[PDB]
Amino acid sequence: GTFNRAMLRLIPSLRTYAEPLTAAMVEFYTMSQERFTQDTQPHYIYSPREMTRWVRGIFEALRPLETLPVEGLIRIWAHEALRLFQDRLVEDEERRWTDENIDTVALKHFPNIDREKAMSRPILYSNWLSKDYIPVDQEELRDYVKARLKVFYEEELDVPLVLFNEVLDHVLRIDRIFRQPQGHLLLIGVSGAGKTTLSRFVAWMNGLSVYQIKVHRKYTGEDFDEDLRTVLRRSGCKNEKIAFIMDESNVLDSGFLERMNTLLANGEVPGLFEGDEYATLMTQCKEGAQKEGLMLDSHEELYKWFTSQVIRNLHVVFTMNPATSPALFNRCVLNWFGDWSTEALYQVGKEFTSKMDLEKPNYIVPDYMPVVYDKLPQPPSHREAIVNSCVFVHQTLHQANARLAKRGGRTMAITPRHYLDFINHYANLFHEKRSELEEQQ
Amino acid sequence: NQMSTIAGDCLLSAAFIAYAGYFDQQMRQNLFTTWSHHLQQANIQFRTDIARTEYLSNADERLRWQASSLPADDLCTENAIMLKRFNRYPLIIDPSGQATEFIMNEYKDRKITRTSFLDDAFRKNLESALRFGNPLLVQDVESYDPVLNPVLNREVRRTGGRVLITLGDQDIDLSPSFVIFLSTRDPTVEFPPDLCSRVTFVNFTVTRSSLQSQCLNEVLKAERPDVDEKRSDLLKLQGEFQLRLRQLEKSLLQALNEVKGRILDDDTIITTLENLKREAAEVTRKVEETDIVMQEVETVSQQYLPLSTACSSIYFTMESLKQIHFLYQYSLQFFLDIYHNVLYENPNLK
């Protein structure tokens, strides 16, 4: 309540909503903490840090805006609730429960409110298409991110990417993290989902400089300390935005993680810069403060400014698969990469099989067609049927692995990388056989 | 018609390559039958009898494989096809080592280097393979070193004019001619889903069904040579006969190019045409009688099926005998020697 009053002191029109909003926040937080516990999923940890992140998100969304209606404040409240609570959830029923109870809490604590404006099914926020972090519709976001993916094909990696709904949602989540104060992300999910790809794509898209640790045979803690020195020197002194991406190839060493937690929490690593290193850090911090326009002279104030710059400049992106301390879970904003849904598989198939012919004008649509994509157009075309069959093949591998596990045999995981491999193989084989027959003809 | 059929054929073949490979022979066949049933249910045209080995390979490559140490089995031919048309670096799970020797023989001209994960000099060799562009076969993958994750995932960063890959603490210049074959000799091994995503599995393990099929094929080859020849003709009719027919067509066109006076010097050139026609008729006959020969070979195979099941059961009892006592170590080659003794040099059969 004190924090919300301080936050809403910016907008005199919403001061009377400081007390109710806080209550709503508290209630929802409590509800989630009762509903989701660490016994189900190890990352279902809730603490006052999530509430501080909620307040910080609402503060960052409200700071540049001159005025808001009450519906806008409730909408950003719901948006931050979704980004902090629903994102970590693994199963679908939990996400549905969270989405309904956000509405329930908002109506309970904010009566006489137009819920249509304060709650549309695709609650969406981004300042990519404007100057301020305003709500934005789904279609223009999809168009803008498709254009940026087309750009990202030339610069950096050349392998194609498909922008389906889950990918775009995760892109928006990672962008929100990259625009938060000390916003650190933990992409937890299945292998091959696209965690590294999307993290790097959003980091490039927002201009962040991707830095990754290169551990080796007997990696020394002194080497990790030097890497941290370089990263914080660039983030704080040089005013450079850095996406500090870490993967399980080096996250598995918890000795570095427990030292990373200090930077994740406070935004500084005391004892990292000492002696000569501390003197050079103070010199460069003085130079940077003068360049920005601050004549801070005392070493303590310079260190405070450096810590603030690291808070506002350095973002750490952890990438892991479903050991890790709950403190690390609670320091980072949790995002879940599930296995690609049927719609995602269908979209990937249609995009990656678009250069193929896959068009029979005399295709007779079968009665009672076996359909795996519920939203598949009826009546389907030949290409639609082919992509449906591809999705069915992936689903049959999943069912086969489930049956083998039930019988007691050893099974391997079918990641979305298997589906991408299958579609690439289909393209190569189709083109090869067509070329062979055409030259024969 | 083959234009009409290629879409379904390639869908099934690509699914087989990408998805099958860890499963046993019956499980691959069940997956293929499920996919074929779905494609038929959706009126997606495909050939009813997809011979995967002959669709995804030609006689020249199969003969070259047989020149190498690739056993002439359906499972091994399918596994070699996966080892050929792979987009992800394969993980070989042979318990015997024939597949590793096959890989070494295939890439001997490319200077393939055999390394192990247990070797302390592994990483260094890997760096060389990444930098100088040489095939590398890394064994003992059950102790997989996660440092290979960027290499298997092909995560490259194109800084400057040099393409890099992060191996350990060092950024190695990836070479276009690099290929790595992971391998293991442990059939009962579990891999993390990360590695499962970065590699394609190629299982050479001999199971009950694989050995049953091997024994059935050997019975058919030994005691019913005519039925074995007819079955081989079915497999060859999936393109090999047409391949040689079109090769003779090309030869006839080449001979018909040189036509100036010598076309009617004897006016008996028609012989070559007759030859093609004859073979055409032959293959046409083999096309017309395909269903009858399929029924015949299936009945003959059902005749010797119980013997094949008996052979599989006998071998697996022999293999399991090691639990009774440590001396009871009997290899598959030992059972095959027993079985060839029973088949060929059996004085009772005289």
Binding site: R407, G408 | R208, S313, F316, T317, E319, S320, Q323
Partner: peptide, 29 residues
């Protein structure tokens, strides 16, 4: 098991259920 792999699960389930039935649940100190 290793001699013939395919029945074993149901038999083991029944055997373990019977064993749980015979073996007393708790022993008092």
């Amino acid at each position: 098991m290793l001699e013939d792999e395919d029945a074993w699960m149901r038999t083991l389930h029944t055997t373990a259920s019977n064993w749980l039935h015979l073996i007393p649940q708790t022993l008092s100190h």
